[PDB]
Design a protein around this motif. Structure first.
Motif, PDB file in Angstrom:
ATOM      1  N   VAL A  95       0.844  -1.206   0.000  1.00  0.00           N
ATOM      2  CA  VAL A  95       0.000   0.000   0.000  1.00  0.00           C
ATOM      3  C   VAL A  95       0.882   1.260   0.000  1.00  0.00           C
ATOM      4  N   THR A  96       1.783   1.402   0.971  1.00  0.00           N
ATOM      5  CA  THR A  96       2.655   2.575   1.102  1.00  0.00           C
ATOM      6  C   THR A  96       3.426   2.836  -0.204  1.00  0.00           C
ATOM      7  N   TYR A  97       3.350   4.053  -0.758  1.00  0.00           N
ATOM      8  CA  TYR A  97       4.156   4.418  -1.972  1.00  0.00           C
ATOM      9  C   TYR A  97       5.646   4.244  -1.673  1.00  0.00           C
ATOM     10  N   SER A 187       3.872   7.759 -11.473  1.00  0.00           N
ATOM     11  CA  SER A 187       4.032   6.784 -10.362  1.00  0.00           C
ATOM     12  C   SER A 187       2.904   6.915  -9.333  1.00  0.00           C
ATOM     13  N   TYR A 188       2.347   8.123  -9.157  1.00  0.00           N
ATOM     14  CA  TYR A 188       1.216   8.320  -8.217  1.00  0.00           C
ATOM     15  C   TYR A 188      -0.004   7.512  -8.665  1.00  0.00           C
ATOM     16  N   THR A 409      -4.357   4.222  -6.931  1.00  0.00           N
ATOM     17  CA  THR A 409      -3.816   5.253  -6.063  1.00  0.00           C
ATOM     18  C   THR A 409      -4.034   4.862  -4.590  1.00  0.00           C
ATOM     19  N   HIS A 410      -3.837   3.582  -4.285  1.00  0.00           N
ATOM     20  CA  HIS A 410      -4.175   2.986  -2.997  1.00  0.00           C
ATOM     21  C   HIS A 410      -3.491   3.727  -1.839  1.00  0.00           C
ATOM     22  N   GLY A 411      -2.246   4.154  -2.017  1.00  0.00           N
ATOM     23  CA  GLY A 411      -1.475   4.778  -0.940  1.00  0.00           C
ATOM     24  C   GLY A 411      -1.915   6.196  -0.584  1.00  0.00           C
ATOM     25  N   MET A 412      -2.852   6.818  -1.311  1.00  0.00           N
ATOM     26  CA  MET A 412      -3.318   8.196  -0.977  1.00  0.00           C
ATOM     27  C   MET A 412      -4.234   8.181   0.259  1.00  0.00           C
ATOM     28  N   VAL A 413      -4.335   9.305   0.982  1.00  0.00           N
ATOM     29  CA  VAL A 413      -5.265   9.448   2.135  1.00  0.00           C
ATOM     30  C   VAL A 413      -6.133  10.695   1.917  1.00  0.00           C
TER      31      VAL A 413
END
Ligand SMILES: OC[C@H]1NC[C@H](O)[C@@H](O)[C@H]1O
Ligand SMILES: OC[C@H]1NC[C@H](O)[C@@H](O)[C@H]1O
Ligand SMILES: [Mg+2]
Ligand SMILES: [Mg+2]
Lengths: 1015, 599
Positions: A95-97, A187-188, A409-413
């Protein structure tokens, strides 16, 4: 100028000077060549040896590199990933970029690969026409130079980038230079759970077209109500100078026979107030009784499109494979060719343990054969467009494809921070529109997907509507934002359970039966991911397949997933071993979470693959008396390559046998009456087994392939014969330390302080290395550990509950140990309590009865405290002194099977080498169990009862302490675990408790018995 | 580097370094000032005298111009169009593009205006906070330099472009340089039937914000069945560093009386599996018996949004006018506040015979008074977003507004050549999304339009769906492609007749009474243009009004159009006369076809 603009840190620039997207072209100059799909002289491959140098950032590249070769560059094979040649580490993160989240910026330390090639261009290519270079995939962004001059820039790793080189090439020697960046603002959008790698990893080609050319073409098929008449509609577009004498012909071929043909000049119908397209033309071709494409029968036609003059001089030809099929949603059901689909699907990543993300024909073909041999009909491209050859092979062999845009874009909050922002709508639209423009002609693609795990934003609804408008012929699906938003035609949850709700805030996962019937809901439901196959998994799989068959609007799903993403490393002696996240010094990382497949990275099957094959079979069976009813689950084919073998056996011994041809229409029944079955004299259970065999080879299987099977109990005769009275009486000796029993050459010794059987002798040969003791624990499985992110611990996971309660540390205290002589036997009575810091967890009461025949009968009664977490098993273990070559058993087999994964296994007499009773999972755990066993033979020992067992050279303690299979060493002797009872393994998901209540050991009291004798 | 990239010939680059779009801000540092709408010290106008030189192409501009003033430059008033000062001719063309159609290229002879200003910035502006420059409209594309250093690039003539200048300004004297091109790839999307002019034609401002700031806010109103109870929902977003002590207050004022108020810390509700927005907050305010906004009675409230600390130190305030009204389509009728509208509308261009396309308060007020004195209740922004003051005056006096994206590609063959092409979807999306983000808070805007005369392509359906999803509170309309496609909530023909059919191939114009009843049709019908007022005209006008009153689903239309687009020339004796296409040596041209007004 290039390091001044920094186009890789700017989401508004996704390309410079890149040509439009289109279906695959070869530019044939001869119609026969186009029809037979022969290699084109106008399409030239640049795969092979290129020069390569690595740099830590783009500012460190010397200016001279544009002009000529660097001295310190190496020769490397293209296509490749540069991490596979050792220039930097591959990174595994879920998950974490793998970079600081600061969109759209990327780190200044941005590893850079400089590739270059020197090549010759023929003089005829420069006189006339257009020459283009095509990169099929580059990860993640790149600039291109030809002969020192800048050509262009591209992003999106998974779709082709094309550039016009006509103005840059010269006769003789040419040099290309390509600078590839690891990170970019692209990459995002590429945060999929997989190895993060980089480089030129798909093919590179040159293509020569004439100046007046076919620039695009689309194929569409429309049908009458009963699929007896079709219209093929072809739209063709040209570029270059329009002349009155230009014509387009489209012909349709079935093998060698032309079946339809049409010709026209350019000029569309009026579209609006300003006119129509002068540079386009639509042909309509009628086809009577077309042969329909499906995954069961993949009938293809060949369409040839020729651009020519009125006098008949050919300018260029293009061609594709055409399948006639209609996909639609009607009254809540997904129909192909008028019939409701049942999807037997799997998710597949492009992964190779030696070559990383480089795919080749041989590996693609190997995957498709194994998928079809295991009853799969569908594949989901998780989560990006595939190599272009993949779609051609799915057209020819017959699989349904879900084609997915490269957006995650799983790592976004929160997850929709970018997909709800209009400044990223340009970047996202390129990823969807270019995929549809490349793949819209393939019959195997039946559903478009908008991406994966990106929440739900307004950019999703816009792109959903864009596809419905340019391609009305396929449904669109999207799981993000709770699986049933306005951006999906299909409800497509991930890991929803059959009966249990998971009521998370904002994005609940209803159980699948409940979801169908929520007020207002009318769509069909297909799981885009279910049944997480991590390690020893797929428990409860049968419960999904029971629901899919009972409910019309549950139309199946895609298992997660096909192949383990492990990589190969070498030790000091050069021995290869399988590696996972963290093994390359990559940090942070997500450890074994990258291995989720039904097959090992080398394409060897896990035991779970057989469970999937059996639940997905295309024949269902019922038994009523002497009659078998066979039901076909085919929608289109008659069963013309199928025969039924039946066998009746009595505790392993064959009694009767037979075969019957299958003659069953699609969705129909056949009744097979069996002969008068034999009445045996002897005691035991009769078993009937049927198997469907394909007698002739197909394109995808050998002759003799078994496609379906099923087993039932018939009549049982209970044994009323009392054991024969022996004349010998076992003798008891009492010391302070021991009870010893002797009978002939056999001797048993029980330790009076520990209260266990501590040794057995046959002659003067010791039989045990460790005493026979109770066991309540297992080396935990991935589903027991319950972790998806290495930084986050769930205190509800089974392994956390077992460690906290002290199941791994519990100490046995002796309550009672007594010996008594009967008339013909010695009886030993023991009781033990397992305690951890005052609290009693388990109590075990045992009797051992040793009689004159030599047999030792063991009876066990266990009590489990109601407020301890339910134990993983209730059984015995010991370490036998001898190692034997074979294991022979009467029970379910022959593969590993567990109480919630045993429907595929069959009762019979099985015989395997010891090494086959161990499953070599890369992350070691409990493995190799066989359930429903009545007799086990190993060396001189025989055990009888009703038990589950596993047997191996590794202890439970060793499997629990060891992180990699290559670090396990065989212990002295053999470890035997014999269980009266064993918990399920779960696998609805692997990051939350997933064992269903009927497979937990929750009864509180347990009884079982064994006989141990010497055969 | 600038003439090397040629960003004006590239539809994939519509801006470089431009900040996000948002509703109008003044950054008040005092709530009372915000409530009473007094002038803000933090918002400074740069309108006035600038230096200007004209060049035939961008390659002819000397390098020295970046550093310092050219000797041969003149002093000119900004805002203006440079054709009105005599540097080249205005061009009047209806359909045919005023350049060779070769998308995305433009001619090498691309007239270029170089503007520059020397100005003072106060020392307190450079110590802390963010300073931004705002161009309200520049036609058609431009590069900006500050103190010799390149700042950014923008396109789309009709919406504001903003750039951060904090890193470029120094204490004392500063110089801005702006190079404006007449033609760009944006010109392919701007083929409206009007004078083609260029320059810095709307206001230029500096705005000072604190580093922790309100970056966006939206206002929404929800009602009970009888409009006796409302909920005002305000969503506020911030930029800068999140602290535990930050708070947002929204208060609602009717004149001098506070009517509602709410306070909260930052932190949205959970949105998905990864959480929610830490930098956002939603307030809900209850209002009993709200006074409803309509064109007949334009009742307004004032909403003040304050960013402050827990101890009560104000960081900044922003404010807007709020009208309570509900627009919806129900059972084939367009309803305002539960009642069926009858639109008495007109199309209006921004046109002044002396100043060209420069609009001022006095002319806007004169138009609105004349419109209302003649029984108009509605205006269509043909065919681009207006000057931001226009929407404020329609809120206060009471007119319904149709707000239209700056997209028209009439001169293409066929008309949808660009709007059906995915490579132009980026350029088109900027024109729609930035308009909605600027104007969504105005009560007078009741309908969004996707543009004008661009055929019907897949880019239209995508943008239609984008608006329905970010702003469910207003219908969307689009006339192109035969007036009743899937990109419109309202059937909106142009020049359909009352009783007579006009059966053109592909795009027929049914008579309006027949159109309502075609098998399957359920939408209401409002003519986006009818009754062409060219010269001595409007015969048969009574026949439309008889139909509009008899049929419930015919809900009126917009006359074409308000004001004649003529310009003033002078004879030998200096006597002014009214000129039309062709009178400036412009060629080809469309003659008197630019004069279509009621006034
Ligand atoms: O392995 C877990 C699984 N969960 C859902 C995601 O879509 C997959 O990519 C994968 O991360
Ligand atoms: O004056 C004719 C009129 N026709 C319809 C167009 O939308 C208007 O801009 C105008 O050109
Ligand atoms: Mg993910
Ligand atoms: Mg027009």
């Amino acid at each position: 100028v290039v390091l001044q603009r920094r186009d890789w840190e700017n989401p508004g620039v996704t390309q410079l000077n890149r040509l439009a997207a289109h279906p695959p072209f070869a530019s044939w100059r001869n119609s026969e060549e186009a029809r037979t799909d022969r290699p084109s002289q106008q399409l030239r491959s640049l795969n092979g040896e290129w020069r390569f140098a690595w740099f830590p950032a783009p500012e460190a590249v010397p200016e001279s590199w544009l002009e000529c070769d660097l001295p310190e560059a190496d020769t490397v094979v293209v296509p490749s990933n540069w991490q596979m040649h050792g220039y930097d580490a591959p990174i595994y993160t879920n998950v974490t970029y793998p970079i600081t989240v600061n969109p759209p910026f990327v780190p200044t330390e941005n590893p850079t690969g400089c590739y270059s090639l020197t090549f010759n261009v023929d003089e005829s290519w420069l006189q006339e026409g257009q020459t283009r270079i095509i990169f099929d995939g580059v990860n993640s962004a790149f600039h291109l130079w030809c002969n020192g001059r800048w050509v262009g820039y591209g992003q999106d790793s998974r779709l082709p980038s094309e550039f016009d080189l006509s103005a840059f090439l010269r006769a003789g020697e040419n040099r290309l230079a390509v600078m590839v960046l690891r990170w970019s603002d692209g990459s995002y959008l590429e945060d999929q759970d997989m190895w993060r790698m980089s480089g030129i990893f798909r093919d590179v080609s040159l293509l020569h077209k004439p100046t007046t050319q076919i620039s695009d073409f689309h194929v569409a098929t429309r049908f009458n109500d009963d699929f007896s008449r079709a219209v093929l509609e072809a739209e063709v577009q040209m570029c270059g100078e329009l002349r009155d004498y230009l014509r387009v012909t489209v012909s349709l071929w079935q093998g060698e026979t032309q079946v339809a043909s049409g010709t026209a000049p350019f000029g569309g119908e009026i579209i609006d107030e300003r006119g129509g397209y002068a540079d386009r033309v639509t042909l309509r071709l009628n086809v009577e009784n077309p042969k329909l494409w499906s995954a069961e029968i993949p009938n293809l036609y060949r369409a040839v499109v020729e651009l020519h003059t009125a006098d008949g001089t050919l300018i260029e030809a293009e061609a594709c494979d055409v399948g006639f099929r209609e996909v639609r949603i009607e009254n809540g059901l997904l129909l192909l060719n008028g019939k409701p689909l049942l999807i037997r699907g799997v998710n597949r990543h492009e992964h190779h343990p030696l070559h990383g993300q480089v795919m080749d024909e041989q590996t693609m073909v190997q995957d498709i054969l194994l998928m079809k041999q295991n009853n799969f009909n569908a594949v989901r491209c998780s989560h990006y467009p595939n190599h272009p050859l993949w779609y051609t092979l799915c057209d020819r062999y017959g699989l349904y494809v879900v084609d997915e845009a490269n957006i995650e874009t799983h790592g976004m909050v929160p997850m929709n921070r970018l997909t709800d922002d209009p400044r990223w709508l340009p970047a996202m639209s390129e990823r969807v529109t270019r995929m549809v423009q490349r793949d819209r002609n393939h019959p195997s693609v039946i559903i478009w997907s908008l991406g994966n795990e990106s929440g739900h934003g307004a950019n999703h609804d816009a792109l959903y509507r864009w596809i419905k408008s340019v391609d009305p012929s396929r449904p669109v699906q999207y799981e993000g934002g709770g699986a049933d938003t306005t951006a999906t035609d299909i409800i497509c949850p991930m890991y929803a359970r059959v009966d249990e709700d998971q009521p998370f805030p904002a994005v609940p996962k209803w159980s699948i039966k409940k979801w169908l019937s929520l007020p207002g809901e009318t769509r069909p439901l297909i799981l885009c991911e279910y049944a997480h196959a991590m390690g020893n998994s797929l428990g409860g799989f049968a419960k999904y397949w029971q629901a899919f068959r009972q409910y019309p609007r549950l139309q199946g799903g895609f298992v997660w997933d096909w192949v383990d993403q492990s990589l190969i490393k070498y030790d000091e002696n050069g021995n290869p071993w399988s590696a996972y996240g963290g093994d390359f010094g990559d940090t942070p990382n997500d450890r074994q979470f990258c291995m989720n497949g039904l097959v090992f990275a080398d394409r060897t099957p896990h035991p779970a693959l057989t469970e999937a094959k059996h639940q997905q079979q295309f024949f269902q069976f019922r038994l009523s008396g002497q009659t078998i009813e066979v039901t076909s689950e085919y929608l289109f084919r008659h069963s013309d390559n199928e025969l039924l073998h039946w066998m009746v056996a009595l505790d392993g011994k064959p009694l009767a046998s037979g075969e019957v041809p299958l003659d069953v229409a699609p969705q129909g029944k056949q009744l097979i009456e069996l002969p008068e079955l034999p009445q045996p004299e002897s005691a035991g259970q009769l078993w009937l087994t049927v198997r469907v065999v394909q007698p002739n080879a197909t394109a995808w299987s050998e002759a003799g392939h078994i496609s379906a099977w099923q087993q039932w109990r018939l009549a049982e005769n209970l044994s009323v014969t009392l054991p024969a009275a022996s004349h010998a009486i076992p003798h008891l000796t009492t010391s302070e330390m021991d009870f010893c029993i002797e009978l002939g050459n056999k001797r048993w010794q029980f330790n009076r302080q520990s209260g266990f059987l501590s040794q057995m002798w046959i002659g003067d040969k010791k039989q045990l290395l460790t005493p026979l003791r109770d066991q309540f624990t297992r080396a935990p499985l991935d589903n027991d550990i319950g972790v998806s992110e290495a930084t986050r611990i769930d205190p509800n996971a089974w392994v956390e509950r077992w460690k906290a309660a002290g199941h791994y540390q519990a100490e046995a205290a002796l309550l009672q140990c007594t010996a008594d002589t009967l008339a013909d036997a010695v009886l030993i009575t023991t009781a033990h309590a397992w305690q951890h810091q005052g609290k009693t967890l388990f109590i075990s009461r045992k009797t051992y009865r040793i009689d004159g025949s030599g047999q030792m009968a063991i009876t066990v009664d266990v009590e489990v405290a109601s407020d301890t977490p339910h134990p993983a098993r209730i059984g015995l273990n010991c370490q036998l002194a001898q190692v034997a070559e074979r294991v022979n058993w009467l029970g379910l087999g022959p593969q590993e099977n567990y109480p919630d994964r045993l429907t595929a296994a069959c009762f019979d007499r099985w015989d395997l080498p010891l090494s086959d009773m161990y499953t070599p999972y890369v992350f070691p755990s409990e493995n190799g169990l066989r359930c429903g066993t009545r007799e086990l033979n190993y060396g001189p020992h025989q055990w009888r009862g009703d038990f589950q067992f596993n047997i191996s050279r590794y202890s439970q303690q060793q499997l629990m302490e060891t992180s990699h299979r290559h670090l396990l060493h065989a212990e002295e002797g053999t470890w035997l675990n014999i269980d009266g009872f064993h918990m399920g393994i779960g696998g609805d998901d692997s990051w939350s408790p997933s064992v269903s209540a009927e497979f937990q050991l929750s009864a509180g009291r347990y009884h079982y018995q064994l006989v141990w004798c010497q055969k």
